């Protein structure tokens, strides 16, 4: 079995997908996501895909930092394990939705009481826009992806 | 236990204390009124086999209150694969001479089904480890039972984070690591044999046995626990066997 | 699918166009880039213990069955267990 590599997070307005490599050759992958002190939850069970949508889990607490890992199982033997009786896996980067998702009134993939929240309902005063003095959304208190793009 | 807290009286009802001639030996866990699970190395040097006792209901080693029960250990069964002096196959199943009575201070910890353990418990992050062992490496052992919540790690992550040498064996499939690498918390000497219990949807189960590590709370190190999921078959089969006429018994493993 | 133009969002989702990319706002029961996975079709034991309180068994072409530990009995709902003894294991009496 080979371990996945290049695990990346692709996130815009909280829609979060993890992507990795390789394209499997007779093997499947399962993903587990957690917060540093939470239990791991599995997703995309035994898939051949190289991406896993995690939105549902990260929008529960966008202010948490999540960590994810991808397990690689030979196809046919989803009970394969390595020398230490565990499945081969690789971890992703940590991701803190609130400080790392990309931006584009707009609604986000964050839901509250079965509905969706919007950019301001989530970034309240951390969100400002620009004109020149066209528009761009900016969250000046960020480290990364502080501005969005324009329209 | 280093960096733990006192387990309030009765919150660790499965905790066993093994004594040899009145002296503290190791900890143990109660799986049912007559069977206790501990670590196999705790009996590497026992020559006073009929001076081995288990205490349940125990909390405060100095004073005596009603709650404690003592039973002699009739048999100690360890894997045939354990080698005296090592840390692999570090599990011991003890058959008490008479059962204990269950009370609010004496309750067994459920011994889970292998699949449930491997598949669900193994991914619960924190479990509690407890004992009356040293409170710091080479420090003073405790008097009131101590308990600590430790995070579990998959070996890849353990091997990846731990520092290269010391008298540190390998992490086999029969072990697992849990703990902190910043030397703040960990299990220690005196806790050996005791439990690593996981709480899953209202019940607690036995996932590990306190086994070994580099010192206690050594920086760049984690505590290593016997992975009980690998012996459930073995345990259950033994707890249904008929008494055979030895005190130390090495039972076939697998 | 291609960005919005080719209605990429399945099972009732709505597409939002981005910088070429799009985002699909799925419905409560589906997730995935293109709202393609049905949350309601992964009732297996590796998925949050199949929803079972204690033990889970997966079965060929038939739903998974939840079970209990000795001293416990499975309840009506098919997932929960109740103790049928005084001191059921893994329970702490003073916290009961
Ligand atoms: C009671 C037996 C009698 C035979 C020789 C070893 C002795 O037990 C021990 C003697 C010295 C140290 C330990 C011991 N240190 C330990 C350290 C750790 C840890 N770093 N988390 C642990 F989990 C268990 C330990 N057990 C220990 O369990």
């Amino acid at each position: 079995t080979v371990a996945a590599y290049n695990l990346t997070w692709k996130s815009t307005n909280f829609k979060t997908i993890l992507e990795w490599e390789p394209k499997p050759v007779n093997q499947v992958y399962t993903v587990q996501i957690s917060t540093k002190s939470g239990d791991w939850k599995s997703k995309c069970f035994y898939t051949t895909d190289t991406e896993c949508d995690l939105t549902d889990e990260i929008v529960k607490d966008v202010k948490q930092t999540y960590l994810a890992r991808v397990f690689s199982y030979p196809a046919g033997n989803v009970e394969s394990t390595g020398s230490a009786g565990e499945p081969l896996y690789e971890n992703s980067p940590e991701f803190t939705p609130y400080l790392e998702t990309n931006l584009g009134d707009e609604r986000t993939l964050v839901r509250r009481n079965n509905t969706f929240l919007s950019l301001r309902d989530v970034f309240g005063k951390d969100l400002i826009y620009t004109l020149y003095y066209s528009v761009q959304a900016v969250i000046p208190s960020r480290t990364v992806n502080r501005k969005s793009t324009d329209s | 236990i280093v960096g733990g807290k006192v387990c309030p009286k009765g919150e660790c009802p499965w905790q066993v204390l093994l004594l040899v001639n009145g002296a503290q030996l190791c900890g143990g866990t109660l799986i049912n009124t007559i069977w206790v699970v501990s670590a196999a190395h705790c009996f590497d040097k026992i020559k006073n086999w009929r001076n081995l006792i288990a205490v349940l209901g125990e909390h405060d080693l100095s004073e005596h209150d009603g709650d404690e029960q003592s039973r002699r250990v009739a048999q100690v069964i360890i894997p045939s694969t354990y080698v005296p002096g090592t840390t692999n196959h570090d599990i011991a199943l003890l058959r008490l001479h008479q059962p204990v009575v269950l009370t609010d201070h004496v309750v067994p910890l459920c011994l889970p089904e292998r699949t449930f353990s491997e598949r669900t418990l193994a991914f619960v992050r924190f479990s509690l480890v407890s004992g009356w062992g040293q409170l710091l490496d080479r420090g003073a052992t405790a008097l009131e039972l101590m308990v600590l919540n430790v995070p579990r790690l998959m070996t890849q992550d353990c091997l990846q984070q731990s520092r290269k040498v010391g008298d540190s064996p390998n992490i086999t499939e029969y072990m697992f690591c849990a703990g902190y690498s910043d030397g703040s918390k960990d299990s220690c000497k005196g806790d050996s044999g005791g439990p690593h219990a996981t709480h899953y949807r209202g019940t607690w189960y036995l996932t590990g046995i306190v086994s070994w590590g580099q010192g206690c709370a050594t920086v760049g190190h984690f505590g290593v626990y016997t992975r009980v999921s690998q012996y459930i078959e073995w345990l259950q089969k033994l707890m249904r066997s008929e008494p055979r006429p030895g005190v130390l018994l090495r039972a076939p493993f697998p | 699918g291609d960005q919005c133009a080719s209605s990429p969002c399945q099972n009732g989702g709505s597409c939002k166009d981005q910088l070429q990319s799009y985002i699909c706002f799925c419905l409560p029961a589906f997730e995935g880039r293109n709202c393609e996975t049905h949350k309601d079709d992964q009732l297996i034991c590796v998925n949050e213990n199949g929803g079972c309180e204690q033990y889970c068994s997966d079965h060929t072409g038939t739903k998974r069955s939840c079970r209990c530990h000795e001293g416990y009995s499975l309840l009506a709902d098919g997932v929960s267990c109740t103790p049928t003894v005084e001191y059921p294991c893994g329970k702490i009496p003073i916290l009961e």
Side-chain angles (χ1 to χ4, degrees), chain B residues 104 108 110 119-120 201 204, chain C residues 45 49 52 54 67 87 89-90:
Chain B
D104 285 25
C110 302
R119 187 189 303 152
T120 303
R201 292 191 66 207
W204 291 81
Chain C
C45 297
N49 201 56
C52 299
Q54 308 194 342
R67 299 184 282 107
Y87 290 107
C89 66

Side-chain angles (χ1 to χ4, degrees), chain B residues 25-26 41-42 45 186-189 192 210-213 215-216 223:
Chain B
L25 177 71
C26 280
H41 71 265
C42 296
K45 306 185 291 180
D186 190 25
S187 52
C188 198
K189 187 179 183 192
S192 326
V210 174
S211 193
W212 62 280
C216 307

Side-chain angles (χ1 to χ4, degrees), chain C residues 14-65:
Chain C
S14 324
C15 182
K16 173 70 176 177
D17 179 60
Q18 303 300 315
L19 301 52
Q20 303 185 60
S21 40
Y22 55 103
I23 297 169
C24 287
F25 289 73
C26 308
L27 283 169
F30 316 86
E31 55 186 293
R33 190 188 301 271
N34 307 130
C35 311
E36 70 272 30
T37 27
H38 297 61
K39 297 179 178 297
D40 298 62
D41 288 297
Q42 20 234 279
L43 192 57
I44 46 172
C45 297
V46 93
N47 180 22
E48 297 289 88
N49 201 56
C52 299
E53 190 176 285
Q54 308 194 342
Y55 299 162
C56 180
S57 265
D58 292 299
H59 292 302
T60 37
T62 182
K63 152 178 283 193
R64 61 94 176 85
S65 58

Side-chain angles (χ1 to χ4, degrees), chain B residues 1-2 24-27 39-46 82 85 90 129 134 137 178-179 185-193 209-218 221-225:
Chain B
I1 297 301
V2 190
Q24 180 171 316
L25 177 71
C26 280
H41 71 265
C42 296
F43 312 98
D44 277 317
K45 306 185 291 180
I46 295 283
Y82 169 79
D90 198 42
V129 187
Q134 297 185 176
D137 193 3
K185 315 181 197 75
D186 190 25
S187 52
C188 198
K189 187 179 183 192
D191 298 310
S192 326
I209 300 170
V210 174
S211 193
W212 62 280
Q214 259 288 323
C216 307
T218 295
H221 291 84
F222 291 90
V224 189
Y225 299 79

